[PDB]
Design a protein around this ligand. Structure first.
Ligand code: MOO
Ligand code: MOO
Ligand code: MOO
Ligand code: MOO
Ligand code: MOO
Ligand code: MOO
Ligand code: MOO
Ligand code: MOO
Lengths: 141, 141, 141
């Protein structure tokens, strides 16, 4: 696909839970990682989402938070993907951070320049990408 | 309204589906286009949303993806608005892209500078704005 | 926590409404302000959210809209926090705006540079931060 989102992950539906107006879709990524997404029930049905369906998960860079220390907090954001900072491209007030994940999957996040300083992000650094389930778009081939 | 969101569209509710905690609102835009939004049920009731109600849909620029080629994928994002690139304002790491839609409605998206290069966006270029239903705020006059 | 989100608010759950796949959580902030969040029901249960639980609400800067005049519109976005512009850091195409709220809580928003001009934001200026309920992550200690 030619889409602006910097994150386009391939995977397979491992389970679906249909709600009233939304549906929760659990996805197993190409390399061990798991994601959850909430999409409208009309999309889950239109896309024919079911266990075993191959899909792509699409996440824009400004929808990914970065965390270097949870400090014992447990978050509601269902998607926590841990890796190492690969590249940092700094702009004026924002910076594009790409992390390398387990298996070689990369994830890019757009965060303020002040976050980069405060978390100590630099190539090599451990960090986790955090993505709320409602910020994941799914796609079917 | 004096609000930072760059996209404020006028329209009318064409249908409402009330869920348990959320509600799906389908909107017909001023010129042919359609949108779907998911808002809390408490807001749908507080705003008195019903078929025929005039409303505004509010979308911040960083919530709009741009796509130039779906490559046969079908996305869950309910809102796909196709047009032509009007203006590009490039910053350091991000760029503000405005598209002109059918009827003359404009939509602005904030994407990384690398997306602009990779999709070949430039004034005149065909592209679609993609917005997940959960990233639309609605307003009533 | 060491997390990129610029907004991390402490508060207590004042009520919870469980849906089919999502749950709505109403939170009373440390100083008078209130927030609503929509998270998956699986998270609400995993985090053991109930009335009186102390939590943190996490919101990234690009998820906060700024409004200086509603012009009589009522929005669906459940979280409207009013204060005064404290600092503005301008980048190339975006600018980071921090507002000081009632009690001394600060909230930072990332908006286009054109929004800053158009709303007349500058230190001292009245403005409200607007955050859709689905853009709030919750955390438990
Ligand atoms: O659509 Mo982007 O380039 O991930 O902000
Ligand atoms: O279906 Mo519920 O959000
Ligand atoms: O349960 Mo979440 O905070 O919507 O990923
Ligand atoms: O509130 Mo904005 O200027 O669409 O990012
Ligand atoms: O059905 Mo969606 O929530 O527009 O991806
Ligand atoms: O993760 Mo942010 O974009 O620095 O609030
Ligand atoms: O009811 Mo909302 O989801 O804060 O627009
Ligand atoms: O200006 Mo940069 O994001």
């Amino acid at each position: 696909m030619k889409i602006s989102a910097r994150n386009v992950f391939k995977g397979t539906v491992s389970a679906l839970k249909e709600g009233a107006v939304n549906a929760e879709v659990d996805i197993l990524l190409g390399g061990g990682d798991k994601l959850a997404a909430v999409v409208t029930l009309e999309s889950a049905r239109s896309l024919q989402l079911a266990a075993g369906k191959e899909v792509v998960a699409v996440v824009k860079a400004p929808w990914v938070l970065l965390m270097t220390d949870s400090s014992g907090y447990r978050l509601s954001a269902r998607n926590i993907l841990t890796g190492t900072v690969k590249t940092i491209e700094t702009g004026a007030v924002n910076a594009e951070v790409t992390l390398a994940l387990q298996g070689g999957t990369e994830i890019t996040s757009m965060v303020t320049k002040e976050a980069v300083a405060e978390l100590g992000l630099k190539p090599g650094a451990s960090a986790s990408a955090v993505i709320k389930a409602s910020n994941v778009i799914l796609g079917v081939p």
